[PDB]
């Protein structure tokens, strides 16, 4: 199984580095693939560029990525994004621009999206989720 981490899981891992997070990651890494979308990486890079301690935050992000596979947002994801965006709009469900791309990438890869806070993420059709806290 491919486990795709949501931006919020990554931000909390870099900022707060909780022991429960590394234990969950080490357990899954033994028989599964831990990855992040290049969309999540775009968000993480924005977090670093926006900060005061850019060099240190980049260093922490680089260390965090040493153990992850960065999956490119590919042509295969686009049909799923199209279908998902339409369906969410039809049901009156509002999702942020990046979260919508991240969700559709998880769907295209048939991956489990690891989220810090579920909220409207469960309302997303054909999406496998796992919540950590």
């Amino acid at each position: 199984m491919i486990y795709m981490l949501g931006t919020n899981i990554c931000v909390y891992a870099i900022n707060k580095h909780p022991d429960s997070y590394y234990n969950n990651l080490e357990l899954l890494a033994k028989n599964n693939t831990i990855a992040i979308s290049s969309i999540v990486l775009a968000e993480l890079q924005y977090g670093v560029s926006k900060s005061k301690k850019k060099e240190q935050n980049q260093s922490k992000l680089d260390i965090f990525l040493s153990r992850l596979e960065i999956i490119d947002f590919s042509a295969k994801c686009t049909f799923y994004y199209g279908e998902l965006r339409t369906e969410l709009e039809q049901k009156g469900l509002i999702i942020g621009n990046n979260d919508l791309l991240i969700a559709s990438h998880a769907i295209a890869e048939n991956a489990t999206l690891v989220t810090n806070n579920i909220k409207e993420f469960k309302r997303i059709p054909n999406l496998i989720l796992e919540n950590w806290d």
Binding site: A75, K76, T78, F79, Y80, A108
Partner: protein, 57 residues
């Protein structure tokens, strides 16, 4: 309906059912979700724009 995947040389191939046979020697391959679209290949950008205009009008 359905079509089988087989090997031709070191390449993978799809055996087309008779009803889906093409009258051209080469096709355009475009991704769509986990799969692909096979269609006639317009020779140029003028043919591309002409072909799109035929669908709409």
């Amino acid at each position: 309906n359905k079509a089988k995947i087989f090997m031709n040389g070191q390449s993978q191939a799809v055996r087309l059912p008779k009803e889906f046979r093409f009258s051209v020697k080469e096709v355009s391959v475009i991704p769509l979700g986990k799969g692909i679209v096979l269609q006639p290949l317009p020779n140029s950008w003028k043919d591309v724009f002409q072909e799109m205009a035929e669908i709409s009008s």
